[PDB]
Swiss-Prot record:
Lineage: Eukaryota, Metazoa, Chordata, Craniata, Vertebrata
Recorded family membership: Belongs to the G-alpha family. G(q) subfamily.
Region of interest: G5 motif: 105-110
Coiled-coil stretches noted in the UniProt entry, renumbered to this chain: none
Disease (UniProt): Capillary malformations, congenital: A form of vascular malformations that are present from birth, tend to grow with the individual, do not regress spontaneously, and show normal rates of endothelial cell turnover. Capillary malformations are distinct from capillary hemangiomas, which are highly proliferative lesions that appear shortly after birth and show rapid growth, slow involution, and endothelial hypercellularity. Sturge-Weber syndrome: A syndrome characterized by an intracranial vascular anomaly, leptomeningeal angiomatosis, most often involving the occipital and posterior parietal lobes. The most common features are facial cutaneous vascular malformations (port-wine stains), seizures, and glaucoma. Stasis results in ischemia underlying the leptomeningeal angiomatosis, leading to calcification and laminar cortical necrosis. The clinical course is highly variable and some children experience intractable seizures, intellectual disability, and recurrent stroke-like episodes.
Complex and partners: G proteins are composed of 3 units; alpha, beta and gamma. The alpha chain contains the guanine nucleotide binding site. Interacts (GDP-bound form) with RIC8A (via C-terminus); promoting GNAQ folding and association with the plasma membrane. Binds NHERF1. Forms a complex with PECAM1 and BDKRB2. Interacts with GAS2L2.
Maturation and modification: Palmitoylated by ZDHHC3 and ZDHHC7. Palmitoylation occurs in the Golgi and participates in the localization of GNAQ to the plasma membrane.
Function per UniProt: Guanine nucleotide-binding proteins (G proteins) function as transducers downstream of G protein-coupled receptors (GPCRs) in numerous signaling cascades. The alpha chain contains the guanine nucleotide binding site and alternates between an active, GTP-bound state and an inactive, GDP-bound state. Signaling by an activated GPCR promotes GDP release and GTP binding. The alpha subunit has a low GTPase activity that converts bound GTP to GDP, thereby terminating the signal. Both GDP release and GTP hydrolysis are modulated by numerous regulatory proteins.
Region (G4 motif): 49-56
Protein's UniProt name: Guanine nucleotide-binding protein G(q) subunit alpha
């Protein structure tokens, strides 16, 4: 009964650090069931926007379980894991009729009394420290 002609926006959450629990490569199964949605006949629209949360589960799930444990494609020199998840999810639609907007909802994204600005301030502190060298 969920009938509506124009859509132009639907929002499903694609989890970012849930790529290890299958008995076969459940993240590849999710990315393969990504194909029957955004290239469907009456789901054909302007664009679709996908939210990838749990970004702070990256450093706590990339060390003991590296990204190549189930995906034999990642060959980068870590944010490269989530960038590779984004690339493997955006290289699915074989048409530029649907531009894909990708948003990485972090966990520090519900309170902004300079809080994300404080993380930026610590990052400028580290990136200003690393400019120095043993002269």
């Amino acid at each position: 009964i969920h009938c509506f002609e124009n859509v132009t926006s639907i929002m499903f959450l694609v989890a970012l650090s849930e790529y290890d629990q299958v008995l076969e490569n459940r993240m590849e199964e999710s990315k393969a069931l990504f194909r029957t949605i955004i290239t469907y006949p009456w789901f054909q629209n302007s664009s679709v926007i996908l939210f990838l949360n749990k970004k702070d589960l990256l450093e706590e799930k990339i060390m003991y379980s590296h990204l190549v444990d189930y995906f034999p494609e990642y060959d980068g020199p870590a944010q490269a894991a989530r960038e590779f998840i984004l690339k493997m999810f955006v290289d699915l639609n074989p048409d530029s009729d649907k531009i894909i907007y990708s948003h990485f909802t972090c966990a520090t994204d519900t309170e902004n009394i300079r809080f994300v600005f404080a993380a930026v301030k610590d990052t400028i502190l580290q990136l200003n420290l690393k400019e120095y060298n043993l002269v």
